[PDB]
Design a protein around this ligand. Structure first.
Ligand SMILES: *[C@@H]1O[C@H](CO[C@@H]2O[C@@H](C)[C@@H](O)[C@@H](O)[C@@H]2O)[C@@H](O[C@@H]2O[C@H](CO)[C@@H](O)[C@H](O)[C@H]2NC(C)=O)[C@H](O)[C@H]1NC(C)=O
Ligand SMILES: *[C@@H]1O[C@H](CO)[C@@H](O)[C@H](O)[C@H]1NC(C)=O
Ligand SMILES: *[C@@H]1O[C@H](CO)[C@@H](O)[C@H](O)[C@H]1NC(C)=O
Lengths: 111, 195, 107
């Protein structure tokens, strides 16, 4: 299992779009009934919430600002408008209905 | 109506992470809750919203004794079978409505959630029975039915799976179906909104 | 949508056992889906186990839930460990959602 997030951190400029990515040797199915790839956001001092991706193009979750994509061996999450709210750590995960293995996390700091 | 402050948990039926087989469908009961059919209307009905006996527009003001939610997954071409007076493999062997049904049938395309590239084979349905199924009847047993010309205590002379794949055209994509069966004025009504 | 509530923290000495609480809001179900997830101090997150099973780690961490409430019961059979981690209760039926608690051991 690889589950590795490449960037250490993103640019801090408010209003500046930016993206992160996670690589794997597990690029297709991991799950029992659907897919293999999710993102979590953990704000400092808080439990994580979920952002949802798939192998073929798909993107879901509660917020509509974020966009998931990926190709090859690498899964990507991007942020468009940066409100300086999204300060914390973003993580990659591979389960679905099914439990999971997990990545290391990447830091997003906004100033 | 009489100081009920609870809200109907429609989200626990409609936003579920897992859906039932056609047979052995999930059946939830809603009572002692304030209805809000604003949510289940022109927000996310997607493909269809077909009601019998009510006008959806004023559904929020009718007041039911009980509301029952029957939830399951079927192949898209079979959606027309979840209706009064219909026949076919689902209507005859898996899920049947009474022909005097007063509820609403809501359905949408779940290809993005249920289909797999190799195929999602976790959804089963009944293909054979000794007789047709009665309205709301459930039968989840296995009878190695296909005796052909010889009764079997082996395999054949049971149930079958669906194959759900993102690319099988349209009629073969899976659909999530929720049926809201209404029990109206058989006892003083308990579930409504604005009244 | 569905919220979870857990006891905020627990503290006890090595050799002792503890139980971690959790309850979910909701009205009815035919079955259960849930996960216990751990965040070690300064690391990413690890699966502890699904509806009473194991994530690959066995022994100290065992559990047995009853229902949608008292859905928890994460049990640590022994605190003779450096597992001064935050534990999370994950909801698996409507939209995935997390809540957590801190469990420690004093010197
Ligand atoms: C069911 O969930 C929706 C929101 O879920 C989104 O849409 C789904 C189809 C799916 O793609 C999910 O992954 C998405 O996150 C609830 O919609 C909310 O309704 C209230 C009404 O006041 C509104 O204020 C919120 O903004 C809506 N939420 C979003 C993200 O738009 C819906 O109420 C839930 N319940 C039912 C019965 O449908
Ligand atoms: C729901 O949407 C349809 C168009 O798709 C519209 O004709 C109808 O009037 C809307 N219903 C209500 C109550 O606004
Ligand atoms: C039910 O919803 C419709 C939507 O157009 C609204 O006009 C109507 O007033 C609502 N019912 C009541 C009793 O308010």
């Amino acid at each position: 299992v690889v589950m590795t997030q490449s960037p250490l951190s993103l640019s801090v400029t408010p209003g500046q779009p930016a993206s992160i990515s996670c690589k794997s040797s597990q690029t297709l199915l991991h799950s029992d009934g659907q897919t293999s790839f999710y993102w979590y956001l953990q704000k400092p001092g808080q439990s994580p919430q979920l952002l949802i991706y798939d192998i073929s193009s798909r993107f879901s979750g509660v917020p509509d600002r974020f966009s998931g994509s990926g190709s090859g061996t690498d899964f990507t999450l991007k942020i468009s408008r940066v409100e300086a709210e999204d300060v914390g750590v973003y993580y990659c995960m591979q389960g679905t209905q099914f439990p999971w293995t997990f990545g290391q996390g990447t830091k997003v700091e906004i100033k | 109506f009489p100081n009920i402050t609870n809200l109907c948990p429609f989200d626990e039926v409609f936003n579920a992470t897992r859906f039932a087989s056609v047979y052995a469908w999930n059946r939830k009961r809603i009572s002692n809750c304030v209805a809000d059919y604003s949510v289940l209307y022109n927000l996310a009905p997607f493909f269809t919203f077909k009601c019998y006996g009510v006008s959806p527009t004023k559904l929020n003001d009718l007041c039911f004794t009980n509301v029952y939610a029957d939830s399951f997954v079927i192949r898209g071409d079979e959606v027309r079978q979840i209706a009064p007076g219909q026949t076919g493999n689902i209507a005859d062997y898996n899920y049947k409505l009474p022909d005097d049904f007063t509820g609403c049938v809501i359905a949408w395309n779940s290809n993005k959630l249920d289909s797999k590239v190799s195929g999602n084979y976790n959804y089963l349905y009944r293909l054979f029975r000794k007789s047709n199924l009665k309205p709301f009847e459930r039968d989840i047993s296995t009878e190695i039915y296909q005796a052909g010309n010889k009764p079997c205590n082996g395999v054949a002379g049971p149930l079958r799976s669906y194959s759900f794949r993102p690319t099988y055209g349209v009629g073969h994509q899976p659909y999530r179906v929720v049926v809201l069966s209404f029990e109206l004025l058989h006892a003083p009504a308990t579930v409504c909104g604005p009244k | 949508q569905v919220q979870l509530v857990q006891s905020g923290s627990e503290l006890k000495k090595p050799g002792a056992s503890v139980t971690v609480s959790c309850k979910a809001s909701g009205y009815s179900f035919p079955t259960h889906a849930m996960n216990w997830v751990r965040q070690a101090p300064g690391q990413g997150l690890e699966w502890m186990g699904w509806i009473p099973t194991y994530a690959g780690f066995t022994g100290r961490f065992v559990f047995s839930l009853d229902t949608s409430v008292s859905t928890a019961y994460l049990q640590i059979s022994s605190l003779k460990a450096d597992d001064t981690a935050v534990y999370y209760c994950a909801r698996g039926h409507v939209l995935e959602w997390f809540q957590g608690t801190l469990v420690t051991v004093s010197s």
